[PDB]
Write a new protein. Structure first.
Length: 620
C-alpha cells in the first residue's frame, strides 16, 4: 500500500502493535506520526509495570525528584512561564461565530474566543510539522467515566511528554482494556506536543520542555478534535479534564440533552439517617475542593466526596437529575491545604501522588504556604525555583497555582457511589464566589427562572488560577466563563428548558459567600469546617421546613435558624445585611453586562428577572 517505506511506522513501536489497533484508531496515529515525526511510538497499556518504568525515565532525565518521606510520591518543577492555564490563548473553531459566542453589542465577547478554520490552518501548519523530532509519541487511550456506563466517552490522546502520561493515568481510566471497550465506536481525537523537538534550539528551564511564545489550545467541535501545543500544565496538557469534560462535553450535552458543568458533587448525611446529594459551582480557587472533603464541626453529620471539579448530569426515567464524576483523581491547589482547613486532603496526598511547583524539605517531605505545620530542628526548605528558601525572603516557597495529583480511591471519605454507572440524584445546587462585601452569607432563589438568573449574575474577584491579577470583581456566570463550548445565550436557554421536561424534579438553588469581609479586612465567617452550619439550613429547606425569610434578593434564614451554637460571637447583622445602595449599583453592572455580552441571544425570562429584581430593590 505504498511505494517507499516512509508511511509504515511499524519499525518504531517500542511497545504494543499497530495491528491490534482499530482501523480508524490506527489511521489517527500514523497520520500525525508522519506530521510530527517522532523517534518512537509507545502505545500505552496502563499497567503498573509501565507506570513504574515511566517514572524511571523522567527521574533519569532530571524532570521529577523522589520524595523519600512518603510512599511513592514525586515532585516536579516546571518552567516559571508555564504554571497556569492561559485563557487568552484558547480558541474554539466553528464555522459561524454565533455558535461559539453571542455577537456582542459594540463591546468584545468575554464568553469565549472564536477563530475561523482558515486562520487555524495557518497557525496549525506553523507549529506541529516536526515538533516531535527525536521524541517518543505516547498513545494514551483513556475513558471519561466508568467503562460501559451511560454517558461514558472514550478518547485517544497523542503526546510526547511522559509527565502527561503519568498524570493521565491518575486523572482518567487509561489502559489496554479501554481499547477493547471502544472497538469501532467514536472517539475524541486529542493531540498534544510540547513544541521542543530535538536537537533543542532553546535551553530548557528546569528541564521543562515548553514554548510559551507559540502556546495555543484549540477546539474543533465539528470534528470531535482537540489540539494543544506549547504548554504542558494541568488543563493545557490533560486534555481529558478541561478541554474534553467541559468545553467539548457541553457541545455534546446541548446536542444530546444532558449537562456538563464545573461543579462538585458531595453527599451529606444527617443525625436522623437521611442522606442527600448537592452540587456547588464555584470559580477556580474559590472553595470547591475544601467543601467536597469537608470535616464538619457538627456532631451527627457526615460529608462524603464524589467529585471536586467536573460534573455530568442528566434526567432519568423517574424525573431525577442524576450526576456522575467522569474523572478518576484529584488535581487541586496545594497552598493553603493544612490539617486544620482540609484534613481529609492530607490523608490522601501521602502516597501515589505527584506534586508540582511545591517546596521540598531536606528530609524528603513537602512544604507550602498555609501548611501550618512546624518542622523538626535542622530541616531545610527548597523553593519551587530550585533555590534555597528561607521564611525571611519575599519569594514564596511554593507557587500559588502549584497542584497535587492524587487518585480518588485513596480519599478516606470517598462516597461509595463515585463509580456507579447510574449516578446519584442531586437535590440542590449552590452558586457563589469571592465577594468581599455586599452579598449575604447565604440566600435561596425564588423560582427556577430566578435561580438561573442568579447563576448568570455571578461575580468574583480575580484569584491566582489564570493570567488575571489584582483585586478586580469580574463576571463569571456559572463559574463556566473560561469553559463555554458554544453560545452562552443558548446555554441560558438549555437550563431554562429543564423546567419544561415532564415529571421534572428540579433541585433548589442557593448562593453563598464565605469571603465577605468587614470594614477592617477580617473574614466575618470562619468557613471550611464551619460551613456545615450553612449546609444544615440547606438540608432542612429541601425537606420542606419553614425556616426561610423573604427579602428583595431571595430567601434568607430567619432569626435563630442557623445552628450558631459554640460560636455566638459572629456578627450576624453585617453578615446578612442587605444595603439598598449596594444592590442598586450591582444591578447596574449586571444590566450592562448582559446587554453587551448576550445581546440578542438573551432569553426573555432572564430579562424578566432582571426587571423583577430591579423593581423589588427600588421599593426599599
Ligand atoms: N475563608 C475561607 N477560605 C476558604 C474556604 N474554603 C477554601 N478556602 C481557601 O481557598 C483556597 C483554595 O480553595 P480550593 O478549594 O482549592 O478552590 P478550588 O478547588 O479551585 O475550588 C485555600 O487556600 C483556602 O484557604 C472557606 O470556607 N473559607
Ligand atoms: Mn476547576
Ligand atoms: Mn479543585
Ligand atoms: Mn419556561
Amino acid at each position: 500500500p505504498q511505494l517507499h517505506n516512509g508511511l509504515d511506522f511499524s519499525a518504531k513501536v517500542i511497545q504494543g502493535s499497530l495491528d491490534s489497533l482499530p482501523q480508524e484508531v490506527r489511521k489517527f496515529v500514523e497520520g500525525n506520526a508522519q506530521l510530527c515525526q517522532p523517534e518512537y511510538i509507545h502505545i500505552c497499556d496502563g499497567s503498573e509495570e509501565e507506570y513504574g518504568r515511566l517514572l524511571a525515565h523522567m527521574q533519569e532525565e532530571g524532570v521529577i525528584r523522589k520524595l523519600k518521606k512518603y510512599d511513592n510520591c514525586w515532585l516536579a518543577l516546571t518552567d516559571p512561564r508555564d504554571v497556569a492555564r492561559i485563557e487568552s490563548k484558547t480558541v474554539i473553531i466553528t464555522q459561524e461565530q454565533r455558535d461559539t459566542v453571542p455577537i456582542p453589542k459594540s463591546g468584545q465577547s468575554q464568553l469565549g474566543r472564536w477563530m475561523s478554520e482558515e486562520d487555524f490552518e495557518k497557525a496549525f501548519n506553523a507549529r506541529f510539522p516536526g515538533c516531535m523530532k527525536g521524541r517518543t509519541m505516547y498513545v494514551i487511550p483513556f475513558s471519561m467515566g466508568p467503562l460501559g456506563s451511560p454517558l461514558a466517552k472514550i478518547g485517544i490522546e497523542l503526546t510526547d511528554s511522559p509527565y502527561v502520561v503519568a498524570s493521565m493515568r491518575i486523572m482518567t481510566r487509561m489502559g489496554t482494556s479501554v481499547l477493547e471497550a471502544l472497538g469501532d465506536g467514536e472517539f475524541i481525537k486529542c493531540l498534544h506536543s510540547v513544541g521542543c523537538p530535538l536537537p533543542l534550539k532553546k535551553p530548557l528551564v528546569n528541564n521543562w520542555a515548553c514554548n510559551p511564545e507559540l502556546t495555543l489550545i484549540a477546539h474543533l467541535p465539528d470534528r470531535r478534535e482537540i489540539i494543544s501545543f506549547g504548554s504542558g500544565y494541568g488543563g493545557n496538557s490533560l486534555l481529558g479534564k478541561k478541554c474534553f469534560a467541559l468545553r467539548i462535553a457541553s457541545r455534546l450535552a446541548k446536542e444530546e440533552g444532558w449537562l456538563a458543568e464545573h461543579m462538585l458533587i458531595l453527599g451529606i448525611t444527617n443525625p436522623e439517617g437521611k442522606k442527600k446529594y448537592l452540587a456547588a459551582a464555584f470559580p477556580s480557587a474559590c472553595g470547591k475542593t475544601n467543601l467536597a472533603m469537608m470535616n464538619p464541626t457538627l456532631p451527627g453529620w457526615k460529608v462524603e466526596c464524589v467529585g471536586d471539579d467536573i460534573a455530568w448530569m442528566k434526567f432519568d426515567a423517574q424525573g431525577n437529575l442524576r450526576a456522575i464524576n467522569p474523572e478518576n483523581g484529584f488535581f487541586g491547589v496545594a497552598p493553603g491545604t493544612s490539617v486544620k482547613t482540609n484534613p481529609n486532603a492530607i490523608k490522601t496526598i501521602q502516597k501515589n501522588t505527584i506534586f508540582t511547583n511545591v517546596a521540598e524539605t531536606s528530609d524528603g517531605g513537602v512544604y507550602w504556604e498555609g501548611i501550618d505545620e512546624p518542622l523538626a530542628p535542622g530541616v531545610t526548605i527548597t523553593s519551587w525555583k530550585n533555590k534555597e528558601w528561607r521564611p525571611q525572603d519575599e519569594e514564596p516557597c511554593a507557587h500559588p497555582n502549584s497542584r497535587f495529583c492524587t487518585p480518588a480511591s485513596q480519599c478516606p471519605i470517598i462516597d461509595p457511589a463515585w463509580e456507579s454507572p447510574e449516578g446519584v440524584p442531586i437535590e440542590g445546587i449552590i452558586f457563589g464566589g469571592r465577594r468581599p462585601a455586599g452579598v449575604p452569607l447565604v440566600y435561596e432563589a425564588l423560582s427556577w427562572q430566578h435561580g438561573v438568573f442568579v447563576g448568570a449574575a455571578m461575580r468574583s474577584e480575580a484569584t491566582a488560577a489564570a493570567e488575571h491579577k489584582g483585586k478586580v470583581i469580574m463576571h463569571d456566570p456559572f463559574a463556566m466563563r473560561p469553559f463555554f463550548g458554544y453560545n452562552f445565550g443558548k446555554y441560558l436557554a438549555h437550563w431554562l428548558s429543564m423546567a419544561h421536561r415532564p415529571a421534572a424534579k428540579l433541585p433548589k438553588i442557593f448562593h453563598v459567600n464565605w469571603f465577605r469581609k468587614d470594614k477592617n479586612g477580617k473574614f466575618l465567617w470562619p468557613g471550611f469546617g464551619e460551613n456545615s452550619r450553612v449546609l444544615e439550613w440547606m438540608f432542612g429547606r429541601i425537606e420542606g421546613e419553614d425556616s426561610a425569610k423573604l427579602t428583595p434578593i431571595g430567601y434568607v434564614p430567619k432569626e435563630d435558624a442557623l445552628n450558631l451554637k459554640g460560636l455566638g460571637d459572629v456578627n450576624v447583622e453585617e453578615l446578612f445585611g442587605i444595603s439598598k445602595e449596594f444592590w442598586e449599583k450591582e444591578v447596574e453592572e449586571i444590566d450592562k453586562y448582559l446587554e453587551d455580552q448576550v445581546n440578542a441571544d438573551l432569553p426573555y425570562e432572564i430579562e424578566r428577572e432582571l426587571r423583577a429584581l430591579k423593581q423589588r430593590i427600588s421599593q426599599m
